[PDB]
Amino acid sequence: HVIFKKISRDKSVTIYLGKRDYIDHVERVEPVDGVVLVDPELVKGKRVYVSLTCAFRYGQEDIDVMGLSFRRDLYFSQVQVFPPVGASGATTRLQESLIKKLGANTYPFLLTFPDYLPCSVMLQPAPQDVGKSCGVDFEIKAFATHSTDIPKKSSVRLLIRKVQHAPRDMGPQPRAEASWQFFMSDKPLRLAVSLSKEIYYHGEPIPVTVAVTNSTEKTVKKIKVLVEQVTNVVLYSSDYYIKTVAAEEAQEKVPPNSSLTKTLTLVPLLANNRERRGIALDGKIKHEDTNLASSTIIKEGIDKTVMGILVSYQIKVKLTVSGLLGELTSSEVATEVPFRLMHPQP
Amino acid sequence: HVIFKKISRDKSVTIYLGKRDYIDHVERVEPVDGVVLVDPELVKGKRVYVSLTCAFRYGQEDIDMGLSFRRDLYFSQVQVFPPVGASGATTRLQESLIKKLGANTYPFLLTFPDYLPCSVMLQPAPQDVGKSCGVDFEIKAFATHKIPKKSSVRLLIRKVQHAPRDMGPQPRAEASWQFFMSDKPLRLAVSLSKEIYYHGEPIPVTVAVTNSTEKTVKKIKVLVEQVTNVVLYSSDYYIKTVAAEEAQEKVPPNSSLTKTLTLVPLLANNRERRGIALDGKIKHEDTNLASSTIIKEGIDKTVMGILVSYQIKVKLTVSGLLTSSEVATEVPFRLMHPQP
């Protein structure tokens, strides 16, 4: 979108990139295309490498106590860029323009993503947690190696994002119908759930049309619709945990042998969901305001399991019915229907 | 398709067309291009118009007798005689027919707008002896002094859709359920082979079910459902099962099963059934089940007529701890004729 630079401490290696965000489509991931500008006197008789790193990070910064920092590399790849051996391969329009502008000391790099990688997802801390941080982030590091024996001064690092957008074509209209049976009763309780579409945007309302046809003597006390964020953490073992994001309930109760068809609109927002621990968010560039994490789309039929933070969404409708032992005691019937919460295509 | 003619009863107007079927590509509909041969002695001082008409029709004959309903969903007409100046843009078909027939041929072009249905009829029951319903298209050329019936000539045409070049995503539907006592879930997932299927082509329905409840899934049943939308004065719906298959396998508590069942929706298995949507006929010939209607996205006017869509319904019979619970989810697909 716009060309940005970062110069190393010793001013030996300068890195150039065209964009911060790199879009993961299901079929293919957008490659990291860029150039490095070197000072030939400063890089005389040393090798320069450009690396791409995907890291699972845990920060902890307690005042007066300790500073513990944890890191696990899910991906690491590097290509040599200096000294040049022959001509470079296929170059992008961005790379060709930048070599043309800067000069002869400019050298291109291309780092690619495989199929088994997550996206830039961070986890929200509580006000109980002052220095705690958790998330998956992507890094490009250009470094020189004076091998007369890695200097920190020659190395220059820059944060990037692997992002997913909403697909060109929408999925099926997500809908489910259920007919439940009780202790001895011949008559059933029927529930039908329907959403307006498969994919919703951040801030967009979700019209959940719910159609309950109660034909029993049982009274439906309240009907509750809730947006559930399914957060999956994969590292050594796969760990699923569910959190409620947005919730609304109808004012009307459903009578015995009577039906109700009501549509309920739910808006999931981070502005309503602040201060809660473990809420998955879309990864920041540098300390800016963010939203709730986008739905992760994984490539089908891949060999290796995807590690990191994987985010799923679902509409749950809960029905409290008057169960056994009378009207005073109650039991639950539920339906879960998944959906995608995603950013629009630019 | 070859060139065909129909002559007026008084032999005043002869209409020529190159084809009967006109393809509704979603972005633009194929226009009706033709010519009209006229007799100048019989048409001296008269005005000739060629019209295109879309009509919803209903017929009733003999129970206790005659009733016919008609709604013109579309009407447009163009004047051809007497000619004022020169013709506009002409197709190669129009130019070839003007040269071959001579001086008294006049071209017509009648275009379709975006909001129109396709040629869809409805199948009657065995007992329904004189009952017929459907949306049909008409081309009519007529002379005007007051319009005589003898001077007019009418000719049936079809608005048809074929399967698009670009196919949509692989159709997937997931749903989970929690029962009355147990907080344990039952998850059902459905996947299809294709987004678009052809007439006669088998549909592989891959059903995946993971049981965590204390309850047993007795039978798994898959249905091909024809959804028929009749729009005139209000939007009305009815759903009819076309093809049905059930698997012999049952799913126990704390178990998982993935099964793939094959269904072939055909009219041959669905004859003698009332309300079944069918692709419109030319004249009494054998047809198939109606093709899935594709409507242009973001159009201003509501589409009237008979609109046909297809869906895969899978329902699981879940036995309790009197009668068993049923849980179901739906997934759409398209059933269409292939590209010529």
XYZ file of C-alpha atoms in Angstrom:
686
model
C 0.000 0.000 0.000
C 2.732 2.433 1.094
C 6.537 1.886 1.160
C 8.139 1.945 4.643
C 11.765 1.585 5.832
C 13.843 0.691 8.912
C 17.597 1.342 9.285
C 19.812 -0.782 11.589
C 21.747 0.670 14.585
C 25.139 0.670 12.784
C 23.402 1.886 9.547
C 24.732 -1.140 7.612
C 21.443 -2.819 6.565
C 18.274 -0.967 5.494
C 15.031 -2.947 4.954
C 12.159 -1.962 2.603
C 8.591 -3.325 2.497
C 5.445 -2.329 0.566
C 2.814 -3.553 3.066
C 2.374 -4.581 6.729
C -0.497 -7.044 6.109
C -0.108 -10.231 4.048
C -3.364 -11.936 3.037
C -3.847 -15.679 3.601
C -6.240 -17.076 0.997
C -7.210 -20.752 1.396
C -5.297 -21.816 -1.769
C -2.208 -19.581 -1.358
C -0.602 -17.053 1.027
C 0.675 -13.643 -0.179
C 4.522 -13.823 -0.181
C 6.780 -11.331 1.617
C 8.357 -9.350 -1.234
C 10.948 -6.680 -0.436
C 14.496 -5.369 -0.885
C 17.555 -4.656 1.296
C 19.846 -1.633 0.881
C 23.405 -2.214 2.130
C 26.426 0.061 2.576
C 29.129 -1.924 0.627
C 32.013 -0.644 2.821
C 30.143 -1.721 5.995
C 29.191 -5.177 4.588
C 32.664 -5.922 3.111
C 33.512 -9.615 3.656
C 30.306 -10.643 5.486
C 27.059 -12.502 4.653
C 23.594 -10.875 4.929
C 20.442 -12.966 5.546
C 16.716 -12.077 5.608
C 14.509 -14.234 7.886
C 10.770 -14.807 8.451
C 9.621 -15.945 11.912
C 6.251 -16.951 13.416
C 6.264 -16.884 17.234
C 3.935 -17.832 20.090
C 4.787 -15.214 22.747
C 4.038 -14.924 26.468
C 5.006 -11.708 28.281
C 4.788 -11.120 32.043
C 5.842 -7.805 33.621
C 5.211 -7.595 37.383
C 6.132 -4.325 39.136
C 8.699 -4.861 41.974
C 8.680 -8.680 41.420
C 9.874 -10.081 38.027
C 9.959 -9.938 34.203
C 9.416 -13.380 32.646
C 9.206 -13.703 28.845
C 8.360 -16.923 26.959
C 8.731 -17.641 23.219
C 8.014 -20.621 20.937
C 8.856 -20.470 17.214
C 6.158 -22.167 15.121
C 7.974 -21.232 11.889
C 11.465 -20.045 10.918
C 12.812 -19.579 7.374
C 15.748 -17.653 5.869
C 17.324 -16.794 2.495
C 20.806 -15.399 1.793
C 20.872 -12.029 0.013
C 24.573 -10.972 0.219
C 27.161 -11.590 -1.298
C 25.278 -11.992 -4.639
C 25.929 -15.216 -6.573
C 24.558 -14.660 -10.092
C 21.282 -12.894 -10.919
C 18.084 -12.963 -8.814
C 14.941 -14.888 -9.875
C 11.438 -13.571 -10.571
C 10.854 -10.147 -8.992
C 7.624 -8.259 -8.221
C 6.764 -4.768 -9.593
C 7.458 -3.387 -6.077
C 10.959 -4.968 -5.979
C 11.793 -3.804 -9.537
C 10.770 -0.183 -8.775
C 12.757 -0.051 -5.501
C 16.011 -1.415 -7.043
C 15.536 1.146 -9.880
C 15.067 4.012 -7.363
C 17.697 3.239 -4.678
C 20.691 2.020 -6.747
C 23.204 -0.788 -7.360
C 23.569 -1.863 -3.691
C 19.889 -2.938 -3.537
C 19.164 -6.698 -3.393
C 15.736 -8.451 -3.432
C 14.341 -11.145 -1.111
C 11.255 -13.377 -1.295
C 10.043 -15.263 1.783
C 7.014 -17.537 1.374
C 4.444 -19.008 3.785
C 3.447 -22.714 3.893
C -0.105 -24.118 4.363
C 0.129 -25.076 8.081
C 0.420 -21.566 9.633
C -1.986 -19.564 11.896
C -2.828 -15.831 11.709
C -1.949 -12.783 13.859
C -4.162 -13.320 16.937
C -3.672 -11.793 20.420
C -5.358 -12.572 23.775
C -6.934 -9.861 25.963
C -5.735 -9.371 29.590
C -7.894 -8.447 32.616
C -7.234 -5.326 34.822
C -5.941 -7.967 37.295
C -3.127 -8.577 34.763
C -0.836 -5.526 34.456
C 2.144 -6.941 32.499
C 0.651 -10.152 31.056
C 0.657 -10.612 27.262
C -0.201 -13.527 24.950
C -0.405 -13.868 21.157
C 0.907 -15.069 17.783
C 2.948 -12.557 15.734
C 5.065 -12.455 12.547
C 8.569 -10.973 12.215
C 10.982 -10.110 9.388
C 14.627 -9.802 10.471
C 17.533 -8.758 8.231
C 20.962 -9.522 9.748
C 24.652 -9.502 8.765
C 27.178 -12.161 9.866
C 30.804 -11.062 10.337
C 32.188 -14.582 10.539
C 35.778 -13.749 11.620
C 35.729 -16.027 14.699
C 25.490 -12.521 14.959
C 25.964 -8.801 15.852
C 22.927 -7.024 17.359
C 23.886 -3.680 15.730
C 23.760 -5.088 12.162
C 20.376 -6.795 12.756
C 17.113 -4.946 12.004
C 13.644 -6.382 12.769
C 10.123 -5.433 11.607
C 6.668 -6.734 12.612
C 4.141 -7.984 10.018
C 0.666 -9.581 10.003
C -0.842 -12.661 8.377
C -4.468 -11.577 7.836
C -7.557 -13.301 6.397
C -10.460 -11.540 4.658
C -14.035 -12.561 3.836
C -14.246 -14.825 0.699
C -15.603 -13.674 -2.703
C -18.548 -16.103 -2.502
C -20.627 -16.561 0.664
C -21.372 -19.961 2.251
C -24.822 -21.636 2.704
C -27.590 -19.979 4.764
C -26.811 -21.396 8.245
C -29.985 -23.002 9.647
C -31.066 -25.923 11.867
C -34.364 -27.465 13.016
C -34.904 -29.701 16.068
C -37.876 -31.613 17.499
C -37.439 -32.651 21.153
C -39.228 -35.281 23.228
C -39.812 -35.421 27.000
C -40.424 -37.890 29.891
C -43.761 -39.492 28.843
C -45.392 -36.901 26.530
C -46.525 -37.812 22.993
C -46.316 -34.189 21.750
C -42.955 -32.589 20.761
C -41.247 -29.213 21.282
C -40.019 -27.914 17.910
C -37.294 -25.273 17.448
C -36.040 -23.734 14.187
C -32.984 -21.437 14.054
C -31.993 -19.262 11.073
C -29.402 -16.566 10.344
C -29.719 -13.997 7.512
C -26.343 -14.971 5.950
C -23.162 -17.072 6.509
C -20.568 -14.260 6.861
C -20.919 -11.093 8.975
C -18.584 -8.091 9.374
C -17.165 -6.519 12.566
C -19.820 -4.181 13.955
C -22.576 -5.592 11.701
C -25.761 -6.854 13.485
C -26.680 -10.564 13.252
C -30.459 -11.065 12.728
C -31.140 -14.432 14.392
C -34.669 -15.484 13.403
C -35.872 -18.092 15.912
C -39.083 -20.117 15.425
C -40.320 -22.169 18.397
C -43.592 -24.107 17.993
C -44.525 -25.364 21.476
C -47.356 -27.929 21.316
C -46.860 -29.401 24.830
C -48.322 -28.419 28.237
C -44.705 -27.434 29.125
C -44.048 -23.687 29.534
C -40.962 -22.121 27.912
C -39.821 -19.626 30.577
C -37.264 -17.604 28.549
C -35.520 -17.779 25.150
C -31.862 -16.692 25.080
C -29.609 -16.065 22.058
C -25.830 -15.772 22.545
C -22.755 -15.205 20.341
C -20.085 -17.737 21.365
C -16.371 -17.303 20.615
C -14.677 -20.712 20.344
C -10.960 -20.167 21.035
C -8.567 -23.035 20.244
C -4.996 -23.031 21.615
C -2.692 -25.607 19.966
C 0.942 -26.081 21.093
C 1.589 -29.341 23.022
C -2.091 -30.293 23.414
C -5.234 -28.931 21.720
C -7.230 -26.811 24.199
C -10.755 -25.550 23.431
C -12.508 -22.888 25.521
C -15.752 -20.978 24.852
C -16.667 -17.389 25.842
C -19.926 -15.432 25.389
C -19.439 -12.178 23.433
C -22.956 -10.763 22.846
C -26.197 -11.912 24.509
C -29.877 -10.894 24.307
C -33.153 -12.446 25.538
C -36.804 -11.935 24.516
C -39.307 -10.219 26.842
C -42.101 -12.659 25.869
C -42.527 -16.148 27.347
C -43.932 -18.967 25.176
C -47.306 -20.339 26.499
C -48.363 -24.048 26.627
C -49.735 -25.134 23.202
C -48.673 -21.868 21.484
C -45.927 -20.756 19.048
C -43.513 -17.810 18.682
C -41.493 -16.612 15.674
C -39.203 -13.758 16.782
C -36.077 -12.242 15.205
C -33.302 -11.048 17.557
C -30.388 -8.851 16.419
C -27.006 -9.220 18.164
C -23.980 -6.925 17.798
C -20.619 -8.441 18.888
C -18.205 -5.657 19.883
C -14.896 -5.458 21.768
C -16.134 -2.131 23.249
C -18.768 -4.166 25.147
C -16.302 -7.041 25.798
C -13.353 -5.201 27.425
C -11.725 -6.168 30.790
C -12.308 -9.934 30.263
C -9.401 -12.412 30.317
C -8.692 -14.657 27.310
C -10.853 -12.882 24.691
C -9.262 -13.451 21.256
C -8.453 -10.298 19.245
C -7.043 -9.536 15.777
C -3.296 -8.797 15.989
C -2.075 -5.203 16.348
C 0.636 -3.491 14.263
C 1.862 -1.245 17.130
C -0.461 -0.493 20.108
C -3.438 0.711 18.001
C -7.152 0.054 18.718
C -8.301 -3.424 17.596
C -11.416 -5.629 17.145
C -12.525 -9.202 18.043
C -10.517 -11.930 16.249
C -11.541 -12.960 12.728
C -12.702 -16.522 11.962
C -9.715 -18.693 10.992
C -9.972 -20.549 7.667
C -7.639 -23.561 7.352
C -6.685 -25.260 4.045
C -8.406 -28.645 3.578
C -6.533 -31.980 3.544
C -3.164 -30.696 4.838
C -0.581 -33.075 6.379
C 0.643 -31.022 9.379
C -1.505 -29.699 12.265
C -1.849 -25.911 12.656
C -0.467 -24.593 15.973
C -1.170 -21.243 17.702
C -4.522 -19.512 18.283
C -7.445 -20.642 16.075
C -10.751 -18.738 16.321
C -14.303 -19.962 15.574
C -17.779 -18.399 15.987
C -21.289 -19.767 16.654
C -24.817 -18.582 17.508
C -26.280 -20.543 20.438
C -29.987 -20.491 21.335
C -30.886 -21.733 24.840
C -34.418 -22.719 25.892
C -35.331 -23.159 29.567
C -38.313 -25.538 29.720
C -40.291 -26.594 32.817
C -38.881 -30.105 33.301
C -39.455 -32.818 35.913
C -40.849 -32.203 39.459
C -43.085 -29.291 38.303
C -42.980 -25.602 37.331
C -40.457 -24.705 40.086
C -37.664 -26.878 38.590
C -36.401 -26.320 35.024
C -34.192 -27.985 32.376
C -32.455 -26.804 29.158
C -32.600 -27.483 25.398
C -30.082 -25.879 23.006
C -29.027 -25.449 19.345
C -25.574 -24.339 18.091
C -25.185 -22.888 14.562
C -21.708 -21.674 13.349
C -20.892 -18.489 11.377
C -17.897 -16.413 10.168
C -17.042 -12.974 11.592
C -14.577 -11.409 9.124
C -13.173 -8.167 7.653
C -14.383 -7.105 4.164
C -12.274 -7.477 0.984
C -10.324 -4.244 0.159
C -32.187 -24.900 -33.489
C -33.334 -24.115 -37.032
C -35.456 -21.318 -38.656
C -39.252 -21.799 -38.320
C -42.371 -19.909 -39.498
C -46.026 -19.403 -38.532
C -48.552 -17.760 -40.890
C -51.676 -15.760 -39.918
C -55.161 -17.246 -40.555
C -55.987 -14.582 -43.194
C -52.378 -14.850 -44.566
C -51.511 -11.210 -43.734
C -48.559 -11.595 -41.308
C -45.871 -14.315 -41.374
C -43.482 -14.403 -38.381
C -39.908 -15.780 -38.576
C -37.637 -16.831 -35.693
C -34.211 -18.515 -35.529
C -34.602 -20.247 -32.139
C -37.236 -21.104 -29.489
C -34.988 -21.004 -26.394
C -33.545 -17.701 -25.160
C -30.823 -17.988 -22.519
C -30.994 -15.984 -19.287
C -27.347 -15.350 -18.466
C -27.541 -13.703 -15.047
C -25.932 -10.392 -16.178
C -27.841 -10.109 -19.520
C -30.775 -11.967 -21.145
C -30.614 -13.116 -24.802
C -32.945 -10.834 -26.867
C -35.619 -12.098 -29.292
C -34.447 -11.287 -32.833
C -36.653 -11.994 -35.858
C -38.452 -10.632 -38.935
C -42.068 -10.310 -40.151
C -43.075 -10.975 -43.775
C -46.134 -8.919 -44.753
C -48.563 -8.805 -47.713
C -48.867 -5.109 -48.809
C -52.358 -5.477 -50.363
C -53.864 -6.970 -47.165
C -51.968 -4.543 -44.888
C -52.651 -1.296 -46.852
C -53.393 1.452 -44.291
C -52.839 -0.875 -41.294
C -50.342 -0.754 -38.389
C -48.321 -3.866 -37.415
C -46.884 -4.402 -33.914
C -44.774 -7.283 -32.528
C -45.166 -7.986 -28.787
C -43.366 -10.010 -26.091
C -45.424 -11.328 -23.150
C -44.728 -13.184 -19.892
C -47.836 -14.800 -18.383
C -48.647 -16.787 -15.250
C -51.496 -19.130 -16.251
C -53.959 -21.410 -14.447
C -56.528 -23.724 -16.080
C -59.583 -25.575 -14.749
C -61.861 -28.007 -16.618
C -64.784 -30.238 -15.509
C -65.515 -31.123 -11.867
C -68.929 -29.496 -11.171
C -66.592 -26.187 -15.321
C -64.383 -23.622 -17.105
C -62.023 -21.333 -15.185
C -58.883 -19.614 -16.490
C -56.637 -17.251 -14.512
C -53.972 -15.087 -16.168
C -51.513 -12.481 -14.888
C -49.260 -10.629 -17.344
C -45.945 -10.393 -15.465
C -44.417 -8.569 -18.470
C -45.616 -6.890 -21.682
C -43.645 -4.925 -24.302
C -44.332 -4.101 -27.970
C -42.608 -2.501 -30.987
C -44.087 -1.114 -34.229
C -42.776 -2.575 -37.520
C -45.275 -1.338 -40.162
C -45.490 1.297 -41.641
C -41.669 1.839 -41.572
C -40.479 5.333 -40.590
C -36.907 5.839 -41.831
C -34.406 3.001 -41.374
C -33.801 -0.018 -39.101
C -31.311 0.148 -36.202
C -28.787 -2.564 -35.344
C -29.588 -5.940 -36.934
C -28.312 -9.456 -36.171
C -26.825 -11.740 -38.880
C -30.026 -13.845 -38.647
C -32.216 -10.794 -39.439
C -30.007 -9.689 -42.373
C -29.998 -13.204 -43.912
C -33.811 -13.509 -43.655
C -34.476 -10.010 -45.122
C -32.317 -10.854 -48.189
C -33.876 -14.319 -48.755
C -37.552 -13.281 -48.434
C -37.383 -9.842 -50.091
C -38.742 -6.296 -49.829
C -41.680 -6.827 -47.427
C -39.697 -8.138 -44.418
C -39.298 -5.947 -41.318
C -36.994 -6.700 -38.331
C -38.001 -6.721 -34.650
C -35.926 -6.830 -31.458
C -37.636 -7.394 -28.101
C -35.391 -7.322 -25.021
C -35.868 -8.850 -21.551
C -35.363 -6.936 -18.271
C -33.562 -8.342 -15.180
C -36.651 -9.078 -13.018
C -38.237 -11.927 -15.060
C -38.754 -15.662 -14.264
C -38.000 -18.712 -16.446
C -40.379 -21.097 -18.280
C -41.579 -23.279 -15.373
C -44.748 -25.439 -15.309
C -46.354 -27.531 -12.513
C -47.188 -31.259 -12.674
C -50.857 -32.249 -12.079
C -52.178 -35.284 -10.133
C -53.745 -38.449 -11.760
C -57.244 -37.225 -10.726
C -56.609 -33.664 -12.018
C -57.956 -34.288 -15.543
C -58.287 -30.678 -16.827
C -55.901 -28.727 -14.574
C -52.736 -26.944 -15.788
C -50.465 -24.277 -14.239
C -47.257 -22.539 -15.372
C -45.269 -19.480 -16.494
C -44.889 -19.238 -20.301
C -43.526 -16.729 -22.849
C -45.177 -15.526 -26.083
C -44.206 -13.657 -29.274
C -47.219 -12.142 -31.073
C -47.394 -10.118 -34.313
C -50.717 -8.437 -35.211
C -52.343 -5.943 -37.618
C -54.422 -2.936 -36.461
C -57.147 -0.981 -38.323
C -59.270 -2.346 -33.274
C -57.304 -5.624 -33.510
C -58.772 -8.548 -35.535
C -58.099 -12.078 -34.203
C -57.650 -13.377 -37.785
C -54.720 -10.990 -38.487
C -52.742 -11.939 -35.335
C -50.168 -14.760 -35.105
C -48.838 -16.145 -31.780
C -45.715 -18.264 -31.219
C -44.410 -19.810 -27.966
C -40.827 -19.195 -26.791
C -38.816 -20.269 -23.701
C -36.625 -18.391 -21.222
C -34.022 -20.986 -20.172
C -31.012 -21.026 -17.797
C -27.861 -23.171 -18.015
C -25.148 -23.929 -15.438
C -22.555 -21.082 -15.088
C -18.860 -21.324 -16.075
C -17.732 -20.461 -12.518
C -18.919 -22.771 -9.721
C -19.497 -21.607 -6.127
C -17.795 -22.963 -2.949
C -18.162 -26.552 -1.646
C -21.534 -26.585 0.217
C -21.075 -27.219 3.961
C -23.518 -27.081 6.886
C -22.862 -27.754 10.586
C -25.239 -27.890 13.593
C -25.076 -29.027 17.246
C -27.845 -29.916 19.746
C -28.250 -30.278 23.495
C -31.045 -32.509 24.853
C -33.430 -32.053 27.823
C -31.550 -33.758 30.704
C -27.952 -34.168 29.459
C -25.672 -31.159 28.844
C -23.697 -33.329 26.344
C -23.867 -32.286 22.636
C -24.761 -34.019 19.348
C -22.897 -32.582 16.335
C -24.033 -33.000 12.707
C -21.965 -31.930 9.676
C -22.919 -32.197 5.974
C -20.766 -31.853 2.839
C -21.571 -32.136 -0.878
C -19.307 -33.102 -3.806
C -20.396 -30.128 -5.972
C -22.289 -26.815 -5.775
C -23.934 -27.464 -9.192
C -25.281 -30.856 -10.373
C -26.723 -31.885 -13.767
C -30.062 -33.610 -14.528
C -29.394 -37.311 -14.053
C -26.040 -36.738 -12.292
C -25.698 -38.566 -8.907
C -25.295 -36.486 -5.710
C -22.766 -37.806 -3.127
C -23.931 -36.561 0.293
C -21.224 -37.064 2.940
C -22.848 -37.052 6.397
C -20.607 -36.757 9.485
C -22.035 -37.238 12.996
C -20.224 -37.239 16.370
C -22.248 -38.499 19.354
C -21.416 -37.355 22.902
C -24.938 -37.786 24.376
C -26.237 -40.803 26.354
C -28.755 -41.288 23.478
C -28.618 -43.546 20.381
C -29.062 -42.297 16.784
C -31.457 -44.882 15.301
C -31.523 -43.935 11.583
C -29.872 -41.350 9.307
C -32.098 -40.084 6.466
C -31.110 -37.840 3.520
C -33.678 -36.057 1.295
C -33.477 -33.984 -1.902
C -36.010 -31.184 -1.363
C -37.529 -29.118 -4.185
C -38.488 -25.696 -2.787
C -41.146 -24.030 -4.960
C -41.693 -20.275 -4.563
C -44.893 -18.907 -6.162
C -44.790 -15.086 -6.257
C -47.779 -13.105 -7.596
C -49.563 -11.007 -4.947
C -47.575 -12.478 -2.019
C -44.547 -14.786 -1.592
C -45.788 -18.370 -1.065
C -43.643 -21.465 -0.360
C -44.045 -25.254 -0.500
C -41.405 -28.004 -0.155
C -41.572 -31.431 -1.868
C -39.190 -34.407 -1.487
C -37.855 -35.679 -4.840
C -35.203 -38.282 -3.875
C -34.822 -40.152 -0.566
C -32.129 -42.492 0.799
C -31.469 -43.964 4.270
C -28.380 -45.729 5.673
C -28.525 -49.096 7.475
C -25.921 -48.074 10.106
C -26.822 -46.699 13.560
C -24.741 -44.400 15.816
C -24.338 -45.488 19.521
C -23.672 -43.168 22.537
C -20.038 -41.906 22.651
C -19.428 -42.846 18.982
C -18.608 -41.311 15.569
C -19.684 -42.251 12.026
C -18.935 -40.761 8.601
C -21.107 -42.145 5.778
C -21.517 -41.100 2.127
C -24.935 -41.719 0.521
C -25.784 -41.285 -3.178
C -29.099 -39.807 -4.403
C -30.375 -39.375 -7.985
C -33.317 -36.879 -8.266
C -35.400 -37.822 -11.336
C -38.896 -37.052 -12.679
C -39.237 -40.756 -13.685
C -39.406 -41.550 -9.935
C -41.654 -38.497 -9.274
C -44.410 -38.773 -11.937
C -48.136 -38.813 -10.933
C -47.420 -36.243 -8.170
C -49.176 -32.880 -7.771
C -47.208 -29.616 -7.490
C -43.846 -30.915 -8.801
C -42.056 -28.060 -10.608
C -41.019 -28.852 -14.198
C -39.090 -27.058 -16.958
C -41.596 -25.596 -19.453
C -42.552 -27.489 -22.618
C -42.645 -26.428 -26.289
C -45.584 -28.730 -27.215
C -46.459 -31.824 -25.093
C -42.947 -33.384 -25.192
C -41.208 -35.202 -22.293
C -39.500 -32.852 -19.798
C -37.401 -32.936 -16.575
C -37.613 -31.477 -13.028
C -37.376 -27.650 -13.120
C -33.906 -26.075 -13.245
C -32.737 -23.947 -10.287
C -33.633 -20.282 -10.861
C -30.773 -17.756 -10.684
C -31.812 -14.153 -9.963
C -29.554 -11.117 -10.590
C -28.172 -9.626 -7.352
C -29.274 -6.170 -6.149
C -32.198 -5.616 -8.555
C -34.900 -3.035 -7.708
C -38.124 -4.884 -8.662
C -39.464 -8.122 -7.117
C -39.408 -11.248 -9.335
C -42.896 -12.701 -9.875
C -43.752 -16.203 -11.177
C -42.564 -19.697 -10.225
C -39.076 -19.745 -8.649
C -37.359 -23.101 -8.037
C -34.526 -23.957 -5.621
C -33.067 -27.254 -4.342
C -31.692 -28.302 -0.933
C -30.277 -31.358 0.856
C -32.102 -32.153 4.106
C -30.539 -34.592 6.576
C -32.534 -35.661 9.660
C -31.388 -37.944 12.492
C -33.855 -40.028 14.521
C -32.543 -39.949 18.113
C -34.014 -42.516 20.548
C -34.469 -41.515 24.211
C -33.423 -42.921 27.600
C -42.959 -43.241 23.519
C -41.497 -41.481 20.435
C -37.978 -40.470 19.328
C -36.501 -36.976 18.835
C -35.613 -35.593 15.378
C -32.708 -33.232 14.579
C -32.085 -31.682 11.137
C -29.982 -29.230 9.085
C -30.243 -27.946 5.475
C -27.679 -27.345 2.690
C -28.499 -25.728 -0.741
C -27.321 -26.838 -4.197
C -28.135 -26.076 -7.867
C -29.735 -28.532 -10.312
C -29.333 -27.341 -13.924
C -28.826 -28.340 -17.574
C -25.224 -28.236 -18.892
C -23.801 -25.424 -21.072
C -24.427 -26.046 -24.844
